[PDB]
Amino acid sequence: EVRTIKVFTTVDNINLHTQVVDMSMTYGQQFGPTYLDGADVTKIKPHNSHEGKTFYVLPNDDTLRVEAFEYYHTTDPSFLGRYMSALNHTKKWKYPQVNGLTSIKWADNNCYLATALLTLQQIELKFNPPALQDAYYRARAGEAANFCALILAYCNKTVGELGDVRETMSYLFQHANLDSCKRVLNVVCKTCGQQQTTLKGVEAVMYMGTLSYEQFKKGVQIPCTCGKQATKYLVQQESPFVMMSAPPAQYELKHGTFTCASEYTGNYQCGHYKHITSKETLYCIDGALLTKSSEYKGPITDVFYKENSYTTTIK
Numbered sequence: 001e002v003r004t005i006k007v008f009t010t011v012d013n014i015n016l017h018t019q020v021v022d023m024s025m026t027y028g029q030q031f032g033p034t035y036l037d038g039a040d041v042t043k044i045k046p047h048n049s050h051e052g053k054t055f056y057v058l059p060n061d062d063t064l065r066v067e068a069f070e071y072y073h074t075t076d077p078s079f080l081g082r083y084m085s086a087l088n089h090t091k092k093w094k095y096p097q098v099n100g101l102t103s104i105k106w107a108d109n110n111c112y113l114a115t116a117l118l119t120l121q122q123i124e125l126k127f128n129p130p131a132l133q134d135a136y137y138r139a140r141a142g143e144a145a146n147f148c149a150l151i152l153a154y155c156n157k158t159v160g161e162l163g164d165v166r167e168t169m170s171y172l173f174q175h176a177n178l179d180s181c182k183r184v185l186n187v188v189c190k191t192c193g194q195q196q197t198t199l200k201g202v203e204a205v206m207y208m209g210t211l212s213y214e215q216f217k218k219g220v221q222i223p224c225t226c227g228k229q230a231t232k233y234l235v236q237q238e239s240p241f242v243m244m245s246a247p248p249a250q251y252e253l254k255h256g257t258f259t260c261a262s263e264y265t266g267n268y269q270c271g272h273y274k275h276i277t278s279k280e281t282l283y284c285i286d287g288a289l290l291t292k293s294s295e296y297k298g299p300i301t302d303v304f305y306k307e308n309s310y311t312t313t314i315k
């Protein structure tokens with residue numbers, strides 16, 4: 001007896017493609033690698049309960065290739081399989097609402113992802129790929145599983161792998177519209193004189209070396225090619241936020257002087273992030289856990305500040 005069911009294949013879970021599948025053959029024999037809500041069903045034969053359901057496939061024809069690129073803005077061949085593999089895990093995570101924000105209950109070393117997600121909800125940022133637009137909208141509403149699996153896929157991290165918050169924000173910023181952001185800097189060495197520099201996009205909102213936006217405005221010391229120590233300071237800034245980063249160090253966070261921050265405790269090989277947000281007081285969100293304090297000191301690695309337009313008074 002020949003037996004078939006109708007199913008739909010997709011790469012973006014919006015555009016559906018009608019298929020008829022033989023129940024005597026595996027999905028892999030018929031579609032190549034195949035996934036059902038993240039589960040790998042390549043080696044599985046169709047079940048009666050599968051009729052009418054949507055399965056993800058790899059982009060193996062030109063129509064799927066165009067749909068996949070338009071939705072995800074990547075042509076990495078392993079992207080979809082990495083996204084599905086992550087999703088099969090992230091759909092089992094818990095996304096509690098903590099002080100009004102979507103967080104993530106700790107699992108699989110996902111603290112870096114929770115603090116990135118909490119941070120995104122406090123800064124003005126729009127994603128360009130529709131996949132990130134759609135999943136971030138759901139994540140804000142509390143259903144963050146697709147968004148978290150997408151972050152992992154875009155950052156080329158697997159579930160359980162130790163991640164860096166600054167690196168993760170850099171990847172997400174790459175897929176965001178920061179084209180309006182502009183940064184002017186000035187560097188003065190007493191032997192080589194001055195050199196001004198202009199930065200755009202992601203490089204205009206991120207800085208590595210100091211956590212303090214004020215010290216960045218007043219000036220910081222850096223090496224020069226002559227061996228002398230030059231000074232770098234901020235001349236002009238156009239952006240809705242800025243991100244200041246440094247190797248973790250004991251740092252004091254004062255209520256009302258920043259938006260949010262990341263704390264990192266541990267070592268290079270493994271550790272733990274927490275999130276600090278300045279609202280009516282200072283709240284520390286550690287996954288599902290919440291505590292408060294009026295003052296905060298701890299090993300901070302990233303701090304986020306609000307911005308609109310800033311111009312220096314330094315002559």
Ligand SMILES: CCNC(=S)N/N=C/c1ccc(O)c(O)c1
Nearest residue numbers: 065068069074075076077079080
């Ligand atoms: C450079 C040729 N690729 C094109 S034209 N479209 N491909 C899009 C795409 C997205 C994710 C994937 O995993 C994948 O295999 C493909």
Ligand SMILES: [Cl-]
Nearest residue numbers: 126127133136
């Ligand atoms: Cl968005």
Ligand SMILES: [Zn+2]
Nearest residue numbers: 189192224226
């Ligand atoms: Zn010099």
